[PDB]
């Protein structure tokens, strides 16, 4: 029994697990809970450092860099190691404190001249797309070479945090265009999380995987085709979510429990005892 | 020491899709809070089989003693316990009547599913839990489930003309679909409401009648608030993201 006790290694693994499952906009509250439950800041700092970084990269946390207008997404595609991240729109690296969500020490970062135009053209089309289609969305576009394939990876984030009204929500989408001329394979995942917690805890978790193709040509024309594909899939996803809500409402939910007995009146609790 | 407060706060934020797993993880994290967490953290109801009477009954912390659970039909523990916690003889008679009454309530409102009621003696009255579980039929490729947990506390007076009732009610509602249009969609969790009032207790208005009205009023209310929160508010929030 004592040989089967929960080790400190297992406690901080659990601590770290809870932290990576914090709802959008509630990292600080889940962290503070876990910090007080574990009651060992040194163990927390050591065993949960990877989880702080994993949360922000998983969540596409947008960060403002002093001196630059556009925010940048914290993603795995930008992880340069040593606590630094790539801003591929401003061609800079920066240090990121995963706890305070603060960027610092921006430095120029080397960038292959090859994909400059293609990444710049997709970034420019996506930025206009995101400003048109989201209330306060942000996007980041990486241009890399994975194996031999020159790849464009587009990430979009959009959140609304209203903790005084006990709800938060976030949309994330991640689009990959693997270039294999005259076409490109398009793979994408769209994610939504919504959390409502006034006298309760209700959460929507949704994701959709996308597989498409597209003919590629010039950098500017292919970026237009890319964004058209994104717009079509994301509009379609959002419409179907709302139709699915309606179906859940008037089919499944109605079938689980009636509003009233068939008498169209509440129960006579003296006749029930009979 | 705010560890229990932090633990309950945590359960309000971690995805309710994993309630069972996170409660066990949480107890691994702070074993000293086990008994407090088992009594204050609602979990999806499980069904067990009373082989003696051939009826289903519902499992929660209130009818648990160690690793056994008490059936509301036979009043016996499974696995068998030699001296498991049981209601007093008089309270047990009220418990049998309550189970029959809420079995009828279940059929009237849910037209299916399973109910269980467990009562226990208090110093100046009694308390009880009313449990209902109903799974959806799977229509239109939607999985649906409903769990009711109604916990009532009854404070009786020496005069026996009036009693104080406090009701704390939780409904857990779970829905999920996997479709080509909307991809995977899991909408789940729970809402909790509380109220209390003094009611006349008389021969024409006995305890079970008073409790049944409180439960029916509360559940009709929570049903409408689930409709509003699940299919109105969270949908509105989704559409405000894009």
């Amino acid at each position: 029994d004592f040989e089967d006790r929960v080790s400190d290694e297992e406690k901080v693994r659990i601590a770290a697990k809870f932290i990576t499952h914090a709802p959008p906009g509630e990292f600080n509250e889940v962290f503070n809970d876990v910090r007080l439950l574990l009651n060992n800041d040194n163990l927390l700092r050591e065993g949960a450092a990877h989880a702080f970084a994993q949360y922000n990269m998983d969540q596409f946390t947008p960060v403002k860099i002093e001196g630059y207008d556009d925010q940048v997404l914290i993603t795995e595609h930008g992880d340069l190691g040593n606590g630094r991240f790539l801003d591929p729109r401003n061609k800079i690296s920066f240090k990121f404190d995963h706890l305070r969500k603060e960027a610092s020490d921006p430095q120029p970062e080397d960038t292959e001249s090859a994909l400059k135009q293609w990444r710049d053209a997709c970034d420019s089309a996506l930025r206009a797309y995101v400003k048109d289609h989201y209330p306060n969305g942000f996007c980041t576009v990486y241009g890399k070479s994975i194996d031999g394939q020159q790849t464009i990876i587009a990430c979009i984030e959009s959140h609304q945090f209203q903790p005084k009204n006990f709800w938060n929500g976030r949309w994330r989408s991640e689009w990959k265009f693997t270039i294999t001329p005259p076409t490109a394979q398009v793979a994408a995942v769209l994610k939504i999380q919504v959390h409502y917690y006034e006298d309760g805890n209700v959460q929507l978790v949704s994701h959709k995987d996308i597989q498409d193709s597209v003919q590629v040509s010039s950098d500017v024309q292919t970026a237009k085709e890319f964004i058209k594909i994104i717009e079509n899939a994301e509009n379609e996803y959002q419409t179907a979510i709302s139709e699915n809500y309606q179906t859940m409402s008037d089919t499944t939910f109605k079938a689980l429990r009636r509003q009233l007995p068939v008498t169209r009146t509440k129960i006579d609790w003296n006749k029930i005892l009979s | 020491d705010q560890q229990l407060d932090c633990a309950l706060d945590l359960m309000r934020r971690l995805p309710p899709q994993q309630i069972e797993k996170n409660l066990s993880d949480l107890i691994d994290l702070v074993p000293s809070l086990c008994e407090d967490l088992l009594s204050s953290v609602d979990q999806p109801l499980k069904i067990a089989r009373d082989k003696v009477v051939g009826k289903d009954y519902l499992l929660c912390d209130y009818n648990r003693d160690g690793d056994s659970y008490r059936s509301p039909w036979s009043n016996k523990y499974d696995p068998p316990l030699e001296d498991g916690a049981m209601p007093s003889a008089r309270l047990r008679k009220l418990e049998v009547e309550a189970n029959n009454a809420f079995d009828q309530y279940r059929d009237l409102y849910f037209e299916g599913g399973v109910s269980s009621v467990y009562l226990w003696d208090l110093d100046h009255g009694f308390a009880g839990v009313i449990l209902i579980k109903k799974a959806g039929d799977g229509s239109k490729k939607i999985k649906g489930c409903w769990d009711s947990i109604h916990v009532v506390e009854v404070q009786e007076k020496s005069s026996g003309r009036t009693a104080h009732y406090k009701l704390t009610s939780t409904v857990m509602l779970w829905l999920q679909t996997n479709k080509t249009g909307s991809g995977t969609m899991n909408l789940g969790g729970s809402l909790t409401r509380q109220m209390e009032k003094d009611e006349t207790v008389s021969d024409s208005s006995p305890h079970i009648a008073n409790i049944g009205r409180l439960v029916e009023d509360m559940e009709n209310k929570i049903r409408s608030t689930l409709n509003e929160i699940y299919f109105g508010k969270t949908k509105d929030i989704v559409n405000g993201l894009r």
């Binding site: 917690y197 006298d199 | 229990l4 407060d5 309950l8 706060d9 309000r12 009594s39 204050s40 953290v41 609602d42 912390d61 209130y62 003693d65 916690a85 209601p87 467990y118 226990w120 208090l122 308390a127 916990v151 506390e153 406090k166 704390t168 939780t170 909790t192 409401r193 509380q194």
Partner: peptide, 12 residues
């Protein structure tokens, strides 16, 4: 956050 289930009666 306010925890309503923490003001319930304790079990048997």
């Amino acid at each position: 956050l306010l925890h309503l289930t923490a003001n319930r009666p304790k079990g048997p």
